[PDB]
Amino acid sequence: SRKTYTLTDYLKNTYRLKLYSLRWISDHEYLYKQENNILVFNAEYGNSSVFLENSTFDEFGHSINDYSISPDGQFILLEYNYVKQWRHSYTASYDIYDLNKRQLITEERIPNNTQWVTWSPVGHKLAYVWNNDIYVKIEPNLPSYRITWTGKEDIIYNGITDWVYEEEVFSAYSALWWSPNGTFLAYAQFNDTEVPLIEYSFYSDESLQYPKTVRVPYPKAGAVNPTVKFFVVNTDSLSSVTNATSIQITAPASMLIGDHYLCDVTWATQERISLQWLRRIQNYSVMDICDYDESSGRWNCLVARQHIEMSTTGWVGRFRPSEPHFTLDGNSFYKIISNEEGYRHICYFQIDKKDCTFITKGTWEVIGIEALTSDYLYYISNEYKGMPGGRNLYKIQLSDYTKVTCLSCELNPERCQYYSVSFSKEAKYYQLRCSGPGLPLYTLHSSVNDKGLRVLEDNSALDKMLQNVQMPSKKLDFIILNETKFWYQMILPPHFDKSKKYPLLLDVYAGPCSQKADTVFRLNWATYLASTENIIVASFDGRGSGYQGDKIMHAINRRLGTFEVEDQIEAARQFSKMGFVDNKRIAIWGWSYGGYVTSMVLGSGSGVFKCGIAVAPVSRWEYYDSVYTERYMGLPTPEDNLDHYRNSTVMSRAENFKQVEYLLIHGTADDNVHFQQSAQISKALVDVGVDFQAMWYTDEDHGIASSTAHQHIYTHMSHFIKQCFSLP
Amino acid sequence: SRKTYTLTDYLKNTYRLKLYSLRWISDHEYLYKQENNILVFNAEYGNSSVFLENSTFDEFGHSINDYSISPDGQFILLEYNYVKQWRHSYTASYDIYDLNKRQLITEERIPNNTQWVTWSPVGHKLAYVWNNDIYVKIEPNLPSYRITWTGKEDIIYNGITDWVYEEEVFSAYSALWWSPNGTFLAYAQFNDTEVPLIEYSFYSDESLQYPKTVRVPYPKAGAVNPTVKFFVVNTDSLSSVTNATSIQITAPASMLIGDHYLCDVTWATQERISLQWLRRIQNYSVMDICDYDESSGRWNCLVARQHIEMSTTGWVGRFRPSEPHFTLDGNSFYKIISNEEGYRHICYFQIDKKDCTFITKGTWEVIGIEALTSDYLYYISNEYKGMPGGRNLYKIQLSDYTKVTCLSCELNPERCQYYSVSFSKEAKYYQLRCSGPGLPLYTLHSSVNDKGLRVLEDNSALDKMLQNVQMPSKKLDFIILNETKFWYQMILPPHFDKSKKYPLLLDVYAGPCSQKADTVFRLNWATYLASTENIIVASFDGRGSGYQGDKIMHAINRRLGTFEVEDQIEAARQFSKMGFVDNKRIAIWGWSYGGYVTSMVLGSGSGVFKCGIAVAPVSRWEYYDSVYTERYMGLPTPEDNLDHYRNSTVMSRAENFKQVEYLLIHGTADDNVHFQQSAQISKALVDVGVDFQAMWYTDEDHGIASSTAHQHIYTHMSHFIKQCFSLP
Ligand SMILES: COc1cc(OC)cc(-c2nc(N)c(CN)c(-c3ccc(Cl)cc3Cl)n2)c1
Ligand SMILES: COc1cc(OC)cc(-c2nc(N)c(CN)c(-c3ccc(Cl)cc3Cl)n2)c1
Ligand SMILES: *[C@@H]1O[C@H](CO)[C@@H](O)[C@H](O)[C@H]1NC(C)=O
Ligand SMILES: *[C@@H]1O[C@H](CO)[C@@H](O)[C@H](O)[C@H]1NC(C)=O
Ligand SMILES: *[C@@H]1O[C@H](CO)[C@@H](O)[C@H](O)[C@H]1NC(C)=O
Ligand SMILES: *[C@@H]1O[C@H](CO)[C@@H](O)[C@H](O)[C@H]1NC(C)=O
Ligand SMILES: *[C@@H]1O[C@H](CO)[C@@H](O)[C@H](O)[C@H]1NC(C)=O
Ligand SMILES: *[C@@H]1O[C@H](CO)[C@@H](O)[C@H](O)[C@H]1NC(C)=O
Ligand SMILES: *[C@@H]1O[C@H](CO)[C@@H](O)[C@H](O)[C@H]1NC(C)=O
Ligand SMILES: *[C@H]1O[C@H](CO)[C@@H](O)[C@H](O)[C@H]1NC(C)=O
């Protein structure tokens, strides 16, 4: 198709995928911003109109990062002066704008450097977090009510997570949950008082004479972890002369024994909250159920509805105990659980009753429960064609669980093997969004008789542009190792020719529960490598990999740096046998867990790879954080799993590097995998007399994502591979 | 046929230079350590005896790092548990061995973590520093007297210097100066209370879970400086329980007007000190003469007896106002000063008069006064044959200044052209140490008729080994640029042949008062480049270079990264117009200041260089320390010299680096030229999209000098030069 997909096209975004991000605001309407206008849509009919004009804030004077609309459609939150913190957190300013009038509010404004903000789920109350304390507004134009007074930077967090909770437990800065009435505000409070602090330089702009030292509470593995407390306050009982009254809910005594985590927080009904908890030695969690006592005003959790989950082979849940999905009345819920064969399925729980009933089962896994109505439960799994990297939507009749409908398997079976979904409030409508193998297709439907309504977006534009490029092809397949199947994917250069030998670059991640072999459509680096440089790009999902049951997933339990490393090697060997691969030119590379695995692979002495790149690699598990590391490794004590903690470092393999060409890269402001970790890799390579190449990116973190640094590192990595593979 | 000088020869020191390190101890004897027996030799006769048995200190229990023997021979200091700090500073433990007994003194020991210790000039009194306070012992087995009570880590330093004074002002950690009676202890006090701290990560051994932040009071250019007070205590009247009295000496009104530095302390007699002071703007310095007053017990500094040295053309001194050398009676003294043609010559001062009288003159410079007796002054200069990179000893008859005898020019004229020297007390004898161009040669001589006594080390062993390798040879000569002579050296491949075209490396330092072209013999990276890889390694002495007078030396005044930079560029061109260097393979490298200059050239756009390497470079003068920077740049304020501080960074030239292949190396624990400087270089290149190479050395500092990091950086640099020069 003559011209090729270029390094510059990736870096510059020549070919963009369209998306269709809607926001349901009721059971039959969604908002959609187009250019900078907000449109309101009707799902059953497809008519549409302008909710807010792109022009409405022309004379605002501050550039607008985002907006949130109140659920009654009365006000809109305006977020400007955004400042990124870590992966999810950030600070920003807010102005609220009243819709039925056309006024901004001068009165009682949210303060600058607000840390989190959220509207109640119904009405137009606001709850915010400033300076680490919680605040509530009953009406946008009124004075707020301070709910906490303990707030203190880096030590006391009311209503927002600290560094580990944010990164490894909630995946969010928020630690507030409104009851559905908007009556109650539950919230969480963290105390980092004794958490050791990571310290690193931040150089900033040229004009800064002295580098700033950044300092952040971060529990490295086996160190003191933050403590957590849970409160619920009643939002309809606030006063200006009287302080807010918070009712604490205590973890259960089976948690209280020792260090633990608050793991999940789910409103069931107006007067019932679910709370899930986990022991630090993450193989035990307790679901508690808490009720409001109208008279007492208290919240009580009855030890008899307490549910328990344990793992015999590993940790609990994929990354954490699953989310509970409650039936409307709050008396029962559905939740994904590993089963007696080790495959993850949905279990039905009745509240005061023992055991649970499996309503799905088989050799495959449910990825998620998506919606639950009186007559149906909706979920997603990789059942179809028995493909672990395929994803489809299913419908289960609740009156008879043997009646399962695939809503997605056949809409477009050659283009569409990998969907997600977004049901409306109450579920009378849904958007399907297919991600591959073909170009992303977004459709709307009515759950009534799963009728298709409209196409929303088909990226037809992009399909026509791509016709003019010589595009690679993606092969998705597997190899049988012991009597087991491990899946791999190859991205092949156009005009692929099994009669010719191509070099191969192995793209690895392979952390616990990962999947690097799927049916998704991507435009990315590997797109340029196979299209312009004609290199094959291979990913392999071996032991330790996810969505295929616990026997594969838990095989790496307490053993990081083994099975997952071995298997990547082995898959490369196999790839060789395959007559179309130059075994003198096989490489490896990876980011984050992937850098760690590539380094350990580069250091095995296998002989299989000529070279490899490691970006932001973990190098010794004692350096990464407690919640993630400990899930897999237990604790670094002689009494628990210290010996394998020490047997799995990159450093100890340094002499083996004399055998390969290695490129090691890190941002010096990485607040997640510390620059420290590659600093110790390079020093070990130095102590042993082994030459390597290196690159640091000053002031970048784990995502090395500024446009300038992102263009630069991929440009730098393109050169190193090109030259490793003798390619001009 | 012979073997070549390999990278491994250099790194492993296969070919070692022999030395002859001796310490004079009377006017006729010296100590010399041999087969680790300490020997005392007789200079006149050559004969030797065992001063301290090698056997002693075998069962001592620790390894001994150095030693120091009382002046009036009763005792010896043993240094162990040595732990280095910065360029000159360190901490250590101390044992004392009483010679006239076979005994280590067991009582009233010098404490561990001692910071500085010193015998008085006669007898056996001890002064030491511990926790930043000074202590005196009159006798080795008795209680010490505490002289200061104000010491405080990183804030108040008594009798030791702080970071800048160690590095830039006194070149030693020490700030104690005993009187010649040993009656008086003088000592400076530095106060760093409001000096900002540079802060950097230090990673240690892999077992350290969290990185430590190093914090060092370090004045960057234009910041607040430490301050200094100056004291003199009488060692003869100290009381058991009574607190000692230290009498203060005030800097003179013309310095107290603003910031200044103490730069020189020199005892003239038993009761007369000399202190030189220097303004922050280093244009004006003052010498004060203090006389002890029998009646008041005070020290008085007669204004009318002050001596003033200003500069209109630059700063004062080569790096700082020079040392005065006092006549035995302390009423006049000698000291190097820039004459009117701007050449540095010895000038004679009489204490209560006001001018001085020159004693040498000419279009060459004196480099140091080395010895003074009632009948002669001895100094080193570069007079011989007009070669400024040469160095020889001369003698001047005080009774007639034109009576000058060159003592070292004709000893071994082909082999020896770069001498230094070391006289006995009173100069009855002296060691000459030739450093090239041939193998170093050490001789002992008698002062009365200046006769050769013996050869002490001639490096014959090395002579024999070296006949078996193909050693490069050194060319030294000069070029004319705009009417003036500028010297360069070339290191040349063996069996060199001027009809062939060799690649050239330009090795640059080029700092103010530097000299990279001279007549000394070195075995170094360059030897290897020329002997194994056939690369001509050139160095050049441009404007700003030293030892050739102020017109060349001050031409860079207030303008760093200017002429010193154009000049290296011009020399390379000229080398290019040589019929034996190919202009396709000219590269350039340098450390420190030289890295700054290497980066500036690389970014000049000249087109002269294919590639270069910068190791630990300055990138922006606002980042380097006050004393040295301001010395040449003045202050970074708009009212002063800001504009050129802003115009002379490496970052500003980033866009040109696309024309060149650049390797940037910097240690992470560099307390001197901070890592931050390179961090900024690399960030500017990235912002602008230039690709380049990099290497960081974890925990190394400005010398990247641990044995493995040294092995590794030169290895790394070699691969990078060879490839740039297409050398297999
Ligand atoms: C591999 O691709 C992705 C994509 C993601 O979505 C952006 C998140 C992650 C992701 N998120 C996290 N919160 C974490 C936990 N720290 C991780 C992760 C897992 C393992 C390691 Cl060693 C490091 C990290 Cl960051 N990885 C990884
Ligand atoms: C040319 O290489 C050498 C050799 C030295 O003696 C071994 C000292 C120095 C030396 N000593 C010093 N005290 C200093 C003062 N900062 C310097 C120096 C000069 C300039 C710069 Cl930009 C940096 C340094 Cl470290 N360089 C340099
Ligand atoms: C859709 O059109 C119907 C009929 O006019 C109207 O009632 C409704 O408000 C329209 N909705 C939107 C969202 O534009
Ligand atoms: C926030 O800061 C801006 C500018 O500094 C100020 O004008 C605004 O009124 C401040 N506080 C708010 C928005 O409540
Ligand atoms: C946080 O924990 C520390 C240590 O246990 C305790 O002393 C401190 O008072 C706590 N603060 C709060 C508000 O919980
Ligand atoms: C409000 O309550 C908190 C504790 O609940 C207290 O510390 C603070 O001072 C109170 N102030 C008032 C208004 O009572
Ligand atoms: C040198 O020999 C002379 C002659 O005996 C002797 O007196 C002197 O002490 C000896 N000195 C040394 C250094 O051994
Ligand atoms: C010095 O250190 C040694 C061990 O290094 C210790 O035993 C001793 O008490 C310390 N104190 C001294 C000797 O001043
Ligand atoms: C050091 O200087 C600070 C002010 O810069 C002053 O407060 C302090 O007294 C001084 N300390 C001493 C012991 O001189
Ligand atoms: C010490 O000196 C003796 C006497 O010559 C020498 O022969 C021996 O090798 C030396 N021993 C040590 C430990 O160096």
UniProtKB/Swiss-Prot annotation, chains A, B:
Q: Which residues lie on this side of the membrane: Extracellular?
A: 1-728
Q: How is its activity regulated?
A: Inhibited by GPC3 and diprotin A.
Query: What cystine pairs are annotated?
Result: C290-C301, C347-C356, C406-C409, C416-C434, C611-C724
Q: Which GO terms describe its molecular function?
A: aminopeptidase activity; chemorepellent activity; dipeptidyl-peptidase activity; identical protein binding; protease binding; protein homodimerization activity; serine-type endopeptidase activity; serine-type peptidase activity
Active-site residues, as the UniProt record annotates them: S592 (charge relay system), D670 (charge relay system), H702 (charge relay system)
What does the annotation give as the result of altering N283A? Does not inhibit dipeptidyl peptidase activity, interaction with ADA and homodimer formation
List the subcellular locations. Answer: Cell membrane; Apical cell membrane; Cell projection, Invadopodium membrane; Cell projection, Lamellipodium membrane
Keywords of the record, alphabetical order, are: Aminopeptidase, Cell adhesion, Cell junction, Cell membrane, Cell projection, Disulfide bond, Glycoprotein, Host-virus interaction, Hydrolase, Membrane, Protease, Receptor, Secreted, Serine protease, Signal-anchor, Transmembrane, Transmembrane helix
Resulting phenotype, N191A: Does not inhibit dipeptidyl peptidase activity, interaction with ADA and homodimer formation
State the source organism's domain of life.
Answer: Eukaryota
Tell me how the protein is altered or processed after translation. The soluble form (Dipeptidyl peptidase 4 soluble form also named SDPP) derives from the membrane form (Dipeptidyl peptidase 4 membrane form also named MDPP) by proteolytic processing.
> Per the entry, what induces it?
Up-regulated by IL12/interleukin-12 on activated T-cells. IL12-activated cells expressed enhanced levels of DPP4 but not mRNAs. Down-regulated by TNF. Up-regulated in migratory endothelial cells and in the invasive endothelial cells in tumors. Induced by hypoxia.
According to UniProt, the tissues expressing it are described as: Expressed specifically in lymphatic vessels but not in blood vessels in the skin, small intestine, esophagus, ovary, breast and prostate glands. Not detected in lymphatic vessels in the lung, kidney, uterus, liver and stomach (at protein level). Expressed in the poorly differentiated crypt cells of the small intestine as well as in the mature villous cells. Expressed at very low levels in the colon.
What reactions does this protein catalyze? Release of an N-terminal dipeptide, Xaa-Yaa-|-Zaa-, from a polypeptide, preferentially when Yaa is Pro, provided Zaa is neither Pro nor hydroxyproline
GO CC terms = apical plasma membrane; cell surface; endocytic vesicle; extracellular exosome; extracellular region; focal adhesion; intercellular canaliculus; lamellipodium
The EC number(s) given in the record are 3.4.14.5
- Major localization class: membrane
* One Pfam family per UniProt: DPPIV_N
Instruction: Please name the GO terms of the biological process aspect recorded for this protein, alphabetically.
Output: behavioral fear response; cell adhesion; endothelial cell migration; glucagon processing; locomotory exploration behavior; membrane fusion; negative regulation of extracellular matrix disassembly; negative regulation of neutrophil chemotaxis
Subunit description: Monomer. Homodimer. Heterodimer with Seprase (FAP). Requires homodimerization for optimal dipeptidyl peptidase activity and T-cell costimulation. Found in a membrane raft complex, at least composed of BCL10, CARD11, DPP4 and IKBKB. Associates with collagen. Interacts with PTPRC; the interaction is enhanced in an interleukin-12-dependent manner in activated lymphocytes. Interacts (via extracellular domain) with ADA; does not inhibit its dipeptidyl peptidase activity. Interacts with CAV1 (via the N-terminus); the interaction is direct.
- What is the purpose of this protein? Cell surface glycoprotein receptor involved in the costimulatory signal essential for T-cell receptor (TCR)-mediated T-cell activation. Acts as a positive regulator of T-cell coactivation, by binding at least ADA, CAV1, IGF2R, and PTPRC. Its binding to CAV1 and CARD11 induces T-cell proliferation and NF-kappa-B activation in a T-cell receptor/CD3-dependent manner. Its interaction with ADA also regulates lymphocyte-epithelial cell adhesion.
Q: Record's family?
A: Belongs to the peptidase S9B family. DPPIV subfamily.
What does the record say about domains?
A: The extracellular cysteine-rich region is necessary for association with collagen, dimer formation and optimal dipeptidyl peptidase activity.
Q: What is this protein called?
A: Dipeptidyl peptidase 4
Q: Which organism is it from?
A: Homo sapiens (Human)
